[PDB]
Design a protein around this ligand. Structure first.
Ligand SMILES: Nc1ncnc2c1ncn2[C@@H]1O[C@H](CSCC[C@H](N)C(=O)O)[C@@H](O)[C@H]1O
Ligand SMILES: Nc1ncnc2c1ncn2[C@@H]1O[C@H](CSCC[C@H](N)C(=O)O)[C@@H](O)[C@H]1O
Ligand SMILES: C[C@@H](C(=O)C(=O)O)c1ccccc1
Ligand SMILES: C[C@@H](C(=O)C(=O)O)c1ccccc1
Ligand SMILES: O=C(O)[C@H](O)Cc1ccccc1
Ligand SMILES: O=C(O)[C@H](O)Cc1ccccc1
Ligand SMILES: [Ca+2]
Ligand SMILES: [Ca+2]
Ligand SMILES: [Ca+2]
Ligand SMILES: [Ca+2]
Ligand SMILES: [Ca+2]
Ligand SMILES: [Fe+3]
Ligand SMILES: [Fe+3]
Lengths: 339, 333
């Protein structure tokens, strides 16, 4: 019953106030996640606002504001000094990392809409985001939304991997988790960014896998002009999560996929996971994330393929898709099992 | 609630975030005015005239559409059921997002006490000022002009505290062609903008500016001009005088620095008390949470009513403001 064109003034007032307040609630979800408040609420059902501020050493008036913001749209409820879970708590907390991504991660982009849309401004580095914050969010995005399909694909491999390469390795956690599952395995993380490599190297060394897992800074799109090509022949498992859209547009993807197939000639399975562009969902029925993901990429000047466009590119790129998993639901996102 | 209702509500909160930034942007880019005027627009046409990246332009319009502010029929965009309300309050959205977005984005870093020394938050001064012009004009002007009309005299020299763009002083000089104007602002940027705008409009011989902190108004030098001032105005910054003890002193210093002021017009939003969380009108939560985050005391209306006398002033008229949280204009003597 959602799409009315005629409403009363009172209704229009309430709706616009909700849109306003939703903005603050939205930012609060990620902030409350980061400050530990969503985990307290989830675990205990309630908490005490002063007691929370004191234990975490937080400016109490702003803590009250954070919780009021959440309460303004029904995520929590305030009752005296107490905050209890509200009707939408479970759902909001489920998707907290998407909110964090939207706000803490990509806030500066969407805030700068007026300066980002003008063509005269769209050269070189024209927007800013928070890499540390995006990295914070993506860990849970990876774990909450992609892991079941990822591990289901790893379980149906039909062989034990001995050397695994991961494209866009980020924190290096995927490679670490792999090493945990397959004790004897070696790992190769490829990433185009210095912070990622360093962060990943540190974590790897700290968790005791400095002997099994290494890294190389490189562009996966131009993987054939990298300085670690001699190690590639040993790789029998390839993984690539949350970055496949960077290989687009179509013709670049085709080439990149060919290059990957030639560069990793002994890879058996290649597990490829990403979010994709949706078509024809009504404006008033967009689920969580979809709009942020698509509008964010349009603002950054980055093309996002549909699922159908991935489907249609694998054969030319040298790969056969033998299984596909739908993700629930991070917009329309999937894991392809390629060989 | 059912699980479907919860999904839908959380999706609305997410998309609302995007619609919310888009209101302010659509304002700046001229899309809201064009929609007010014609009732519709063409996404291609608009993108081409404004030389904008069209796929991002469609995004902006689908954000607005996602919550009922507009509706899309292919490339045609028509005003939606919530257009008039949102357009009305567009400056508030702009303020929250383009002005103050970076403060609320950094919530996790701003709340911890160890982080709250020195320059611990950032806002966009240019953007805030952009919004503030319309906030002042749309929300405060009617009460401001009503107070001017009922002053009981015609001013000769007006001083404006936190003068910003200089617009309020310009408009007063338009109403009272013989008036001398003086603007006090703490920001060099405001002083520069105001001097430029005044000089450009032809009022450079009538309106001057001095950089100064209105809280310590007694410490700003102005060639003895303060003593000639017979009308004082201060909009949208009075809460900066607080807490109470500081306000009492600043009020007493203003009284002393401006001995010949007859009326002092003091306009501001205030902290509300007891509004139910799910019934919060537009702005209230942003205004109050923003200042709580910034460490800035915000008084209630009653706190203001209770401070004037000890501050050396008598309140003689009060005006309610329409639909800007709880906002008022006091007239003081
Ligand atoms: N063309 C490219 N080649 C290699 N790495 C890339 C790339 N484009 C982006 N990346 C890297 O891919 C990452 C995107 S998000 C990382 C999430 C990570 N894959 C995970 O599953 O947890 C960033 O670390 C970025 O540096
Ligand atoms: N303590 C202080 N003393 C003087 N000016 C101040 C101040 N605190 C803030 N300001 C200035 O007050 C302005 C707040 S915005 C209000 C603009 C103006 N009064 C109007 O009605 O449109 C900014 O220009 C800011 O620099
Ligand atoms: C990492 C992120 C992304 O592409 C981005 O932030 O630009 C992403 C990719 C895929 C699913 C979810 C988030
Ligand atoms: C300028 C703003 C404010 O207090 C702030 O930006 O800190 C304000 C004050 C009063 C009404 C509306 C906005
Ligand atoms: O065409 C597809 O849908 C997928 O890209 C891969 C696939 C093909 C056939 C059977 C399963 C998976
Ligand atoms: O106490 C008040 O309400 C205001 O401070 C101003 C006022 C007082 C008395 C008569 C009129 C106005
Ligand atoms: Ca409806
Ligand atoms: Ca298909
Ligand atoms: Ca309307
Ligand atoms: Ca303006
Ligand atoms: Ca003086
Ligand atoms: Fe991306
Ligand atoms: Fe303020």
């Amino acid at each position: 019953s959602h799409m009315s064109t005629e409403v009363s003034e009172a209704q229009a007032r309430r709706a616009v106030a909700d849109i306003f307040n939703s903005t603050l609630a939205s930012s609060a979800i990620g902030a409350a996640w980061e400050l530990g408040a969503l985990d307290e609420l989830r675990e205990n059902g309630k908490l005490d606002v002063s007691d929370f501020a004191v234990r975490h050493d937080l400016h109490e008036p702003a803590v009250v504001g954070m919780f009021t913001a959440l309460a303004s749209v029904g995520i929590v409820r305030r009752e005296g000094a107490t905050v209890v879970v509200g009707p939408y708590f479970d759902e909001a907390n489920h998707h907290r990392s998407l909110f964090h991504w939207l706000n803490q991660g990509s806030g500066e982009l969407f805030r700068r809409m007026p300066q980002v849309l003008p063509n005269e401004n769209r050269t070189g580095k024209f927007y800013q985001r928070d890499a540390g914050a995006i990295s914070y969010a993506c860990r849970e995005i990876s774990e909450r939304y992609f892991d079941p399909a990822f591990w289901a694909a790893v379980d149906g491999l039909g062989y034990t991997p001995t050397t695994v390469a991961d494209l866009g390795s980020g924190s290096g956690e995927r490679l670490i988790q792999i090493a945990r599952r397959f004790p004897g395995v070696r790992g190769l993380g490829v990433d185009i960014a210095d912070g990622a490599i360093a962060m990943a190297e540190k974590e790897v060394a700290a968790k005791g896998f400095g002997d099994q897992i290494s890294f190389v800074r490189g562009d996966a799109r131009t993987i054939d002009q990298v300085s670690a090509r001699g190690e590639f022949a040993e790789v029998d498992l390839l993984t690539c999560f949350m970055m496949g859209h960077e290989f687009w547009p179509r013709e670049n993807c085709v080439q990149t996929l060919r290059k990957l197939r030639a560069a990793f000639p002994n890879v058996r399975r290649f597990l490829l996971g990403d979010a994709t562009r949706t078509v024809g969902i009504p404006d008033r029925e967009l689920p969580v994330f979809t709009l942020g993901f698509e509008f964010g990429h349009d603002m950054m000047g980055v093309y996002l393929p549909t699922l159908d466009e991935w489907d249609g590119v694998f054969e030319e790129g040298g790969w056969r898709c033998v299984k596909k998993h739908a993700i629930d639901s991070l917009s329309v996102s999937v894991v392809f099992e390629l060989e």
